[PDB]
Curated annotation (Swiss-Prot), chain D:
Subunit structure: Component of the small ribosomal subunit (SSU). Mature yeast ribosomes consist of a small (40S) and a large (60S) subunit. The 40S small subunit contains 1 molecule of ribosomal RNA (18S rRNA) and 33 different proteins (encoded by 57 genes). The large 60S subunit contains 3 rRNA molecules (25S, 5.8S and 5S rRNA) and 46 different proteins (encoded by 81 genes).
Localisation: Cytoplasm
Similarity section: Belongs to the universal ribosomal protein uS10 family.
Its job: Component of the ribosome, a large ribonucleoprotein complex responsible for the synthesis of proteins in the cell. The small ribosomal subunit (SSU) binds messenger RNAs (mRNAs) and translates the encoded message by selecting cognate aminoacyl-transfer RNA (tRNA) molecules. The large subunit (LSU) contains the ribosomal catalytic site termed the peptidyl transferase center (PTC), which catalyzes the formation of peptide bonds, thereby polymerizing the amino acids delivered by tRNAs into a polypeptide chain.
Post-translational note: N-terminally acetylated by acetyltransferase NatA. Also partially acetylated by NatC.
Gene: RPS20
Covalent link (Glycyl lysine isopeptide (Lys-Gly) (interchain with G-Cter in ubiquitin)) residue numbers: K40
Protein name, UniProt field: Small ribosomal subunit protein uS10
Parent-protein residues present: 62 to 121 of 121
From Swiss-Prot, chain F:
Cellular-component GO terms for this entry: 90S preribosome; cytoplasm; cytosol; cytosolic small ribosomal subunit; ribosome
Record-linked NCBIfam families: PRK04027.1, uS7_euk_arch
Main location (coarse class): cytoplasm
Descriptive protein name: Small ribosomal subunit protein uS7
Localisation: Cytoplasm
Family according to the record: Belongs to the universal ribosomal protein uS7 family.
Coiled-coil regions, chain positions: none
Positions bearing the Glycyl lysine isopeptide (Lys-Gly) (interchain with G-Cter in ubiquitin) cross-link: K26, K184
PTM comment, free text: N-terminally acetylated by acetyltransferase NatA.
Cross-referenced InterPro entries: Ribosomal_uS7, Ribosomal_uS7_CS, Ribosomal_uS7_dom, Ribosomal_uS7_dom_sf, Ribosomal_uS7_euk/arc
Origin organism lineage: Eukaryota, Fungi, Dikarya, Ascomycota, Saccharomycotina
Keyword Acetylation: yes
Swiss-Prot record, chain G:
GO cellular component term of the entry, any: cytosol
Subcellular location: Cytoplasm
Something else known: It is presumed that the precursor part of S25 is engaged in assembling of the small subunit, thus being essential in ribosome maturation.
Gene Ontology MF terms: structural constituent of ribosome
Stretch of the intact protein here: 36 to 105 of 108
Alphabetical UniProt keywords: Cytoplasm, Methylation, Ribonucleoprotein, Ribosomal protein
Species in which this protein is naturally found: Saccharomyces cerevisiae (strain ATCC 204508 / S288c) (Baker's yeast)
Gene Ontology BP annotations: cytoplasmic translation
Chief location category: cytoplasm
Quaternary state and interactors: Component of the small ribosomal subunit (SSU). Mature yeast ribosomes consist of a small (40S) and a large (60S) subunit. The 40S small subunit contains 1 molecule of ribosomal RNA (18S rRNA) and 33 different proteins (encoded by 57 genes). The large 60S subunit contains 3 rRNA molecules (25S, 5.8S and 5S rRNA) and 46 different proteins (encoded by 81 genes).
Protein name stated in the entry: Small ribosomal subunit protein eS25A
Keyword Cell membrane belongs to the record: no
Family: Belongs to the eukaryotic ribosomal protein eS25 family.
From Swiss-Prot, chain H:
Compartment(s): Cytoplasm
Taxonomic source organism: Saccharomyces cerevisiae (strain ATCC 204508 / S288c)
Primary gene name: RPS17A
Family of this protein: Belongs to the eukaryotic ribosomal protein eS17 family.
Complexes and interactors: Component of the small ribosomal subunit (SSU). Mature yeast ribosomes consist of a small (40S) and a large (60S) subunit. The 40S small subunit contains 1 molecule of ribosomal RNA (18S rRNA) and 33 different proteins (encoded by 57 genes). The large 60S subunit contains 3 rRNA molecules (25S, 5.8S and 5S rRNA) and 46 different proteins (encoded by 81 genes).
Descriptive protein name: Small ribosomal subunit protein eS17A
Function comment: Component of the ribosome, a large ribonucleoprotein complex responsible for the synthesis of proteins in the cell. The small ribosomal subunit (SSU) binds messenger RNAs (mRNAs) and translates the encoded message by selecting cognate aminoacyl-transfer RNA (tRNA) molecules. The large subunit (LSU) contains the ribosomal catalytic site termed the peptidyl transferase center (PTC), which catalyzes the formation of peptide bonds, thereby polymerizing the amino acids delivered by tRNAs into a polypeptide chain.
Remaining remarks: Present with 30900 molecules/cell in log phase SD medium. There are 2 genes for eS17 in yeast.
Residues represented out of the complete protein: 2 to 68 of 136
Length: 141, 55, 63, 60, 145, 206, 70, 67, 143, 80
RNA sequence: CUUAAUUGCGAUAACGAACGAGACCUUAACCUACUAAAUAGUGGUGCUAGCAUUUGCUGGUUAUCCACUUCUUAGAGGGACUAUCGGUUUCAAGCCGAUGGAAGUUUGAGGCAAUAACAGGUCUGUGAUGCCCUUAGACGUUCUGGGCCGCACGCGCGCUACACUGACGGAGCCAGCGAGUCUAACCUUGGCCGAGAGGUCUUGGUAAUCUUGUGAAACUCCGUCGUGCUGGGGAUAGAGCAUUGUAAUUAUUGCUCUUCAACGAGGAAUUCCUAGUAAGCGCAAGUCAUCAGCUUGCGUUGAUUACGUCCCUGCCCUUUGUACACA
């Protein structure tokens, strides 16, 4: 029982839950440092919240994340969201508002949708094609 | 029997391959009356009294 | 090569029977105050800047 | 959700119109610690045509 | 791996198993042009011959090759599992062979004849120059013969 | 750069550049600029990013396509020809190598070279098939800046994919090559030839 | 079967005497010199790296990059 | 397309016809007015009506509106 | 400072574990290695050819260390890739339940895994020991 | 025997159940009523039974070889 | 004029309504607000393992306890009305841009769908049916076997490819829609044996409980090969082993070795599509004893180019001609 918040992040169908408890600055993802998230070209996608907002700000907290669902990309876009939504949820309850509204400002001015969850989602396919818009081929005899 | 089967000349790939294709192969539908559908064939024609009786 | 810069003044509409062509009046930035209406190819909005390859020639309705 | 996907045509003619019916099943459970007097009062009453009540016992 | 500096020892095209083998290609895949021996079989043999797979064909000191032939035409005396082989339960003596690079042409005939000579419907189907594994002959296979 | 070390450690090279200048993989989104008039407002450098993988709603409105980081619009057009649809991670890696390749030759900050190529290949004017009756002549037109950029992205990427086909050289090398030869055209890049010949035929009908 | 799937001692010297002035050196660079096939071209890369001539600036398979030593 | 049907516009007409001493230029309160003043069978329909009584309200304040 | 294997890049860990089981010799490999295929959905044997039992054991070890318990039927499904069915569409196919059952056994006799209850195989208390060791040795090359 | 129990029950004002009035058409045209009369009365009884609307359709063939059909509808109905 | 819409604005011998479009319904999106959940899951604590030791980090423990409902579930509500502001416009319906917003392309995708027409298809779905035919050497029915797969060829839907954005080999390793056995043998974990396919011993599940985290595939990582029909390609074919079934020959399917074809991007032509869409990629379900290169859905990776017009084609609308009205 210390200062702590839990937050989530949802890309396509991935969800990334992230508890933000007061600590000595660690950031784990399902079991592992944020330096081992590899599909690895996107590595700086999940570092990104740390660098937009300065590598400090974590020395008083510990972040842990576990992602279920999604895929090798959808999960990477969901953890960064829960990491940044949580770093800004922590300044909600514990640090004051002006610090928090500086953080929303420095994310949304960059915002690869870091606090705002992307509404895009697979459209249902309908009979007559392999896709949702695509149709089967025809011939007119 | 199966003896006659392989012994039989005039059989197997080579034989047919050496034959001209019938032109009935690459035909069309031939359609056989798709454009006299509306012209009834019964030659009868239901009257109008037997219609007004019914309906 | 005498190159000619020309800011789009106004959107006038789609010419060309297919439609991929748009009628637009432009204003050059060097020596403004004289306008030319040109036929564009790509999608165009107000205040874009067109590279007129030759200056003194304008077009009208297309087929 | 019990899906059933089927062509509308009895025959084969026409564009291939498909059609899927569904039947949704809602299953609740409520755990009660009670004596015999209520559970038997509560099984006879609160019957409803079309709501299948099932009462089991034994935490084992 | 390494940078090697072979002398004039390495040779270009070399002949074995009544065939010809390209020297400047890897030895595992060099043995493939020999008929009846393929990727898997060539691999296991070279492993069994205690030979460096990284070597090309033009490498392989003459001792190594003579070994590689020996194991190919006797897989059962050198522990190759008798399901690694193209002819098991033969048809007459029931042994387990591996037909190799000119005999495989012979044994296709040997087999195809055993069917024709017996009037099995499969044979008849071969003699007619058709497909025998049962595939529909309406649409496919029109250029072939 | 005032480093800070917490429990699970962030590497020095990582710590260093990130909170510093907000630059690319390890390239500078700074002084890179467009050596031309419009083709400005239609190249994205500033704003900067780290890698060119952005789930951006760039299509659901007409012109907002022009807000995508141009470097990423270069990649997006690599990942195609059917077999490579999707496969952005593939592409995203091809660019990093290309830029690094282009970096080695002619130092020239490479995200600026990518700019120079897109500029130097967009056909300024072009032609369409006006009716005229049966026998259709060609009316010269002046192509928009957006179509100028778009066409430069396809033009570059295609002939380089076509180069890297059936040959020992890779996608990144051929992509690097065509790009480099397009930073100031050299009559040998598949692109420049098309650009030049789209302003040669747009000239012959005027 | 087209020229230099082997070492060809003169070719070793070629590599030692020609890699200077290569601003870019990679697999496709080594073959383009009427020279080594891609396999032994890939072995030279870690060799010329054993000391000196090349600086490894790229990382991995499917793309290598080296640069003149300074 | 976002052209409101008649029943929306017809309702807005009928409401501004007889409850002008209410229904400020704010939709949200117009919404909360509609529940108590008119019987509407669905939130979506009621929102669509109140959103339009709002518009018609807002331009009356500058000049009349015919109907 | 303290070390888990989850602190190590999954690739170089197994490679470091691969060299270990190699350098050691207390292995119990089957012997049909170099001739087996590792899945029906494969064309060629592995290229390690003396090895790849170390690599898989090391892989197998890490995977079971990461969770409660798994079975041979699970590793079949994990290590199984897509089988080209010639002219027919690709399909996922499970891998050899013999390589894996023998990898499980050869690691248990070597005391890195035990037959967990609830079914399966559990990470050995002695495997925890030896894994976090070589993991800590892996972050030694990076000091 | 015993574990199943059946109870008849008068239906409340049949003139508002489709199925009832369908089997009434049947038990008119079989009893020989004029098709227009038969359908038109059914519509009248359903209406006097207090419906918002009713609609009877007869399809098939009466006395004439050809097939025809007839909508018989009165009052209010919606369809979507 | 506007709209996706007889959608409206406006004009107005019309005024004011109804069917149909809209509304409505279903699903996918937003709730740290409401009601809780050992068949969902978190934080604490025991009990417990490993590494560092400095308090840490990383796990185990279908009830050793405590509390919570952010995550999952589904009830009740709420939320959006193209809002606010601004351009444009008969300053009308509306439209366009900007901010805000989960969401502003009918929010996205469907379900429902008036009047009418067709000699459209279906008597081979029906113990729906008129008439005609047949009805014991049967056109009834059952049983044995064969055939619907037959092969000079023409056409259509597809699958797999021509490689280096690649094959292959190791390693990383991530979804969602589903189904699943009583008077019975469905979905199958785990342990063994087997190279493989499989086999054998057991086991959980009538199911958010067990199969299943369906560890799927593309994909990501390190290697091998190096442009050569090559290790691209996997047709044809020989030989062996297995499963389904009373039965596998004209080879149901699966596995192993071998054999290694055409195909070097495709003439005239022609199909589909505007955002989580196209394309690539697998999966579940339907059929199913066994067999998917099919289909219905599903998630995963994820673009390019329009955001226009009537030129091509197709269809609606007026005007107009008619000796047509079975049109
Ligand atoms: Mg061969
Ligand atoms: Mg896998
Ligand atoms: Mg694998
Ligand atoms: Mg294939
Ligand atoms: Mg209605
Ligand atoms: Mg909740
Ligand atoms: Mg916005
Ligand atoms: Mg007919
Ligand atoms: Mg019928
Ligand atoms: Mg048939
Ligand atoms: Mg079809
Ligand atoms: Mg192959
Ligand atoms: Mg692979
Ligand atoms: Mg055996
Ligand atoms: Mg049981
Ligand atoms: Mg070949
Ligand atoms: Mg093509
Ligand atoms: Mg199936
Ligand atoms: Mg079918
Ligand atoms: Mg349109
Ligand atoms: Mg008239």
């Amino acid at each position: 029982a210390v200062p702590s918040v839990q937050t989530f992040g949802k890309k396509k169908s991935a969800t990334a839950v992230a508890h933000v408890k007061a600590g000595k600055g660690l950031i784990k993802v399902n079991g592992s440092p944020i330096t081992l998230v590899e599909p690895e070209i996107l590595r700086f996608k999940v570092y990104e919240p740390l660098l937009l907002v300065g590598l400090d700000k974590f020395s008083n907290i510990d972040i842990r994340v576990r992602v279920t669902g999604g895929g090798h990309v959808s999960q990477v876009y969901a953890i960064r969201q829960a990491i940044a939504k949580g770093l800004v949820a922590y300044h909600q309850k514990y640090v004051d508002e002006q610090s928090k509204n500086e953080l929303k400002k420095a994310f949304t001015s960059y915002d690869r949708t870091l606090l705002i969850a992307d509404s895009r989602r697979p459209e249902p396919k309908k009979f007559g094609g392999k896709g949702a818009r695509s149709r089967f081929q025809k011939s007119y005899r | 029997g199966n003896e006659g089967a392989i012994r039989d000349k005039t059989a197997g790939r080579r034989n047919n391959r050496s034959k001209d294709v019938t032109d009935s192969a690459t035909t069309k539908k031939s359609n056989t009356r798709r454009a006299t559908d509306r012209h009834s064939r019964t030659g009868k024609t239901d009257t109008k009294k037997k219609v007004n009786q019914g309906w | 090569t005498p190159v000619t810069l020309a800011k789009v003044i106004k959107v006038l509409g789609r010419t060309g029977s297919r439609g991929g062509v748009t009628q637009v009046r432009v204003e050059f930035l060097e020596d403004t105050s004289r306008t030319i209406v040109r036929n564009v190819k790509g999608p165009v909005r107000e205040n874009d800047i067109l590279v007129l390859m030759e200056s003194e020639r304008e077009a009208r309705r297309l087929r | 959700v019990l899906k059933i996907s089927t062509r509308k045509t009895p025959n084969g003619e026409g564009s291939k119109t498909w059609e899927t019916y569904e039947m949704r099943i809602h299953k609740r459970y409520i755990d009660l610690e009670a004596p015999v007097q209520i559970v038997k009062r509560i099984t006879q009453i609160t019957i409803e045509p079309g709501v299948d009540v099932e009462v089991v016992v034994a935490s084992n | 791996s390494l940078v090697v500096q072979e002398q004039g020892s390495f040779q270009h095209i070399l002949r074995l198993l009544n065939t010809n083998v390209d020297g400047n290609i890897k030895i595992v895949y060099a043995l493939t042009t020999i008929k009846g021996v393929g990727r898997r079989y060539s691999n296991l043999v070279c492993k069994k011959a205690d030979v460096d797979l990284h070597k090309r064909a033009g490498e392989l000191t003459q001792e190594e090759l003579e070994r590689i032939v020996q194991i190919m035409q006797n897989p059962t005396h050198y522990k190759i599992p008798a399901w690694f082989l193209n002819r098991q339960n033969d048809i007459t003596d029931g042994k387990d062979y591996h037909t190799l690079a000119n005999n495989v042409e012979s044994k296709l005939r040997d087999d195809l004849e055993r069917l024709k000579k017996i009037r099995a419907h499969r044979g008849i189907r071969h003699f007619w120059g058709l497909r025998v594994r049962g595939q529909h002959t309406k649409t496919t296979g029109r250029r072939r013969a | 750069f005032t480093p800070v070390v917490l429990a699970t450690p962030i590497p020095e090279e990582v710590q260093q550049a990130q909170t510093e200048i907000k630059l690319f993989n390890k390239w500078s989104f700074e002084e890179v600029e467009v050596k031309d008039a419009s083709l400005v407002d239609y190249v994205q450098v500033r704003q900067p990013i780290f890698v060119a993988h952005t789930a951006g709603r760039y299509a659901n409105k007409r012109f907002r396509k022009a807000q995508c980081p141009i470097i990423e619009r270069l990649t997006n057009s690599l990942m195609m020809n059917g077999r490579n649809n999707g496969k952005k991670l593939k592409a995203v890696r091809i660019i990093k190598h290309t830029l690094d390749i282009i970096n080695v030759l002619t130092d020239q900050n490479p995200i600026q070279v990518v700019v120079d190529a897109i500029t130097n290949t967009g056909p300024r004017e072009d032609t369409t098939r006006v009716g005229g009756g049966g026998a259709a002549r060609r009316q010269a037109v002046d192509v928009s800046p957006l179509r100028r950029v778009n066409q430069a992205i396809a033009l570059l990427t295609i002939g380089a994919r076509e180069a890297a086909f059936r040959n020992i050289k890779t996608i990144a090398e051929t992509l690097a090559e065509e790009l480099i030869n397009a930073a100031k055209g050299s009559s040998t890049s598949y692109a420049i030839k098309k650009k030049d010949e789209l302003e040669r035929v747009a000239k012959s009908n005027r | 079967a087209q020229h230099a799937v082997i070492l060809d001692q003169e070719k070793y010297d070629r590599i030692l005497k020609e890699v200077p002035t290569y601003r870019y050196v990679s697999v496709s660079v080594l073959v383009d010199r009427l020279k080594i096939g891609g396999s032994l071209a890939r072995i030279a890369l870690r060799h010329l790296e054993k000391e000196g001539i090349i600086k490894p600036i790229s990382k991995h398979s499917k793309q290598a990059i080296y640069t003149r030593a300074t | 397309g976002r052209v409101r049907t008649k029943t929306v516009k017809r309702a807005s007409k009928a409401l501004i016809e007889r409850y002008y001493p209410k229904l400020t230029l704010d939709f949200q309160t117009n919404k909360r007015l509609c529940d108590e003043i008119a019987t509407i069978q669905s939130k979506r329909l009621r929102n669509k009506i109140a959103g339009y009584t709002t518009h018609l309200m807002k331009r009356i304040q500058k000049g009349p509106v015919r109907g | 400072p303290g070390v888990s294997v989850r602190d190590v890049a999954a690739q170089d860990f197994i490679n470091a574990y691969a060299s270990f089981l190699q350098r050691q010799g207390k292995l119990e490999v089957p012997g049909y290695v170099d001739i087996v295929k590792t899945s029906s959905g494969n064309e060629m044997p592995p290229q390690d050819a003396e090895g790849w039992f170390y690599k898989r054991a090391a892989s197998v070890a890490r995977h079971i260390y990461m969770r409660k318990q798994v079975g041979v039927g699970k590793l079949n499904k994990l290590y199984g890739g897509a089988k080209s069915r010639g002219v027919r569409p690709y399909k996922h196919i499970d891998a050899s339940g013999s390589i894996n059952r023998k990898v499980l056994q050869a690691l248990e006799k070597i005391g890195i895994v035990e037959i967990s209850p609830k079914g399966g195989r559990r990470i050995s208390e002695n495997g925890q020991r030896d894994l976090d060791r070589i993991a800590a040795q892996t972050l030694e090359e990076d000091e | 025997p015993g574990t199943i129990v059946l109870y008849a029950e008068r239906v409340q004002d049949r003139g508002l159940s489709a199925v009832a009035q369908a089997e009434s058409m049947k038990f008119k045209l079989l009893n020989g009523l004029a098709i227009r009369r038969a359908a038109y009365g059914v519509v009248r009884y359903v209406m006097e039974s207090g419906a918002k609307g009713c609609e009877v359709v007869v399809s098939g063939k009466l006395r004439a070889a050809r097939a025809k059909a007839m909508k018989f509808a009165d009052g209010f109905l919606i369809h979507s």
